[model samples]
Target: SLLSDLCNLNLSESTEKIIAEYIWIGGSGMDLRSKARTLNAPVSDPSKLPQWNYDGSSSEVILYPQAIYKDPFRRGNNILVMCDAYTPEPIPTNKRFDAAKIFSEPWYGIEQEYTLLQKEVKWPIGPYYCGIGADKAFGRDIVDAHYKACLYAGINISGINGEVMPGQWEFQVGPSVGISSGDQLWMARYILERITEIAGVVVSFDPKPHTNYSTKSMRSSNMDPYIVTSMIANTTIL
Candidate 1:
């Protein structure tokens, strides 16, 4: 429904690695200062998708149906962003700064940005350094706040089940989250930014969340009502 509702921008074919690297560079291309630009340029949409008539009656910025988020270490979710139907020249990293700024505000609770970065993608190259700030206990407290925020937004940020590792714990956010407003994208970004500011810790959602000092603890299963969700959408507020 959402995909067919708002499809704009022409796209070029891109590899999973290229897409991963795009986010690795922080929302845009690495060439911020250079006259040169990424080869993957964007084109206008050839086949327009259905548009949702909202109350605003204002259509300016093209919020493509496809959105993606990536953690610096290469994890999160990617669906439409990687498709060739989308733009080839990825949105520049400089643009990402604006997106980050827009979503970082507390009132807006722009959590979706972080969700775009947390995509479970592997950049073709080696590790990238898109530093995030987090406490020594990365996802624990951060996740706790996330649930509270979701509840405040009238979102279902509950975890049916939970598990704890040496440095982390996660519970399932559930399909109910899927039905809620937007996906956990904005909520995740909002919480990550807040945690970064408060704890000087960067949150990560990697499949193998074991890096320098990072340790991850979460699992996926259709059977577990509570454990299938990611850390970002799990809390008691639900």
Candidate 2:
């Protein structure tokens, strides 16, 4: 069912629509006035919201536990980022509503799209592949689909279908890297690759596309033939 859902997705349009709605809008740092008003306002009963066990981590975020698992993040689970600032110092950029880390190792569940993914979700790195190559290979399609999924879940962003070679596809990721979208794409790639493999198509990713001397920088082309010729051209490449 997951694979079916994954296969039945519209890559560019869905991702574009979702990211266009809700990226970088929420979190402790964002909407400071709203957060401040909520924090400064006096509550008739402080006991209603119990103080959490502060000893867990240096970064403690208090949030409605239910709202944590959604998109730019839904392929994941929920997390509680302390809504209130514990100390006067501004919260570290790294700790504030970080989508990347959340999707990287998602401590709660296997399908968690918010927090970080566990080791099992990550592709194994053998002696034959570099981490970046593996990342590009396994991540490109996932990035495209997740971007669309994040859009479907209501995020505001756009991604492009790109690749270095035939049967190799990738999406142009956004400007920010640390936000952890890479993990999302990598997961999508794993899904797409398996789908392609099942269909008897060989797929791969390469940063240089071709390491051979002549065509290193010549990666971009105007059209992808596979998408262009649906009925004819069986050999068309994207």
Candidate 3:
């Protein structure tokens, strides 16, 4: 049932009221936030995605849409829009957050590792890590849903597979050229989170939730090491 309704989703033409989820990095670098916005048509260009204002008192931030993708979860005209946060003056809030400043033409990939837990019960459906059969793989349905969703969304998802432990999985989001690496990765994370929302499951990104876990880890790799350190100081990693 997770198949995108092609009849309702007309990619060749525009439609009315495209639901756009404007996603951005929150105050914390690790956290993300989003706002539900509607577009006049099924727009796919970042230039057409307008900047919007949030609650000034609590979260006065500007969302500048960076990347646009199809909304694989929702039927009809809908899209998932990724954005970068900026000040009122349109300046980058944090230097690190500035994709343009960080790299003129950068290429990288993110290996996102996550754990799926049953809602409220805080129970992980074990026996699903690189597992087989209905009994061994508990949350394969969710994983399948996400894989299809990402494919429909036009994300550069290299591959996805179960991790070392049960209920844990890893998905690759890169090799995105230019400043779009961050955008694509963030959008992929959002899509994963959204797909699990209705299924009443929690996606855990903790490095070490299970004490008896393997030495597994999630890593973000940049193409150029020298260019990275050059942004901070006269630092060089040997």
Best by lDDT: 3
C-alpha-based local distance difference test score of model 3: 0.64
- CA lDDT scores, all candidates in order: 0.28, 0.28, 0.64
lDDT of 3 at 167: 79
Question: Which candidate would rank higher by TM-score, 1 or 2?
Answer: 1
Number of the top-ranking candidate, with TM-score as the measure: 3
lDDT of 1: 0.28
Residue lDDT tens for model 3, 1-238: 4553453555436445667887776654556677787767666777877778676356566677767777775655577777666665443443335446544423455466888888768678644457787556657889899888888888888788885576778887656653555566667777788777877788876665500111123232232222243333222111
Candidate 3, number of clashes: 0
lDDT at 65 for candidate 2? Answer: 14
Please write out the lDDT profile of model 2 over residues 97-140, one tens digit for every residue. Answer: 33322322111111111111113433221221222454444434
**Candidate 3: where is the Cα deviation over 4 Å?**
1-15, 89-97, 126-129, 210-238
User: What residue runs in model 2 are displaced by over 4 Å at the alpha carbon?
Assistant: 1-69, 72-89, 92-141, 163-238
Q: Give the TM-score of each candidate.
A: 0.30, 0.25, 0.74
Tens-digit lDDT string for candidate 1 (48-69): 4222111112212222322332
Q: What is the lDDT of residue 62 in candidate 3?
A: 67
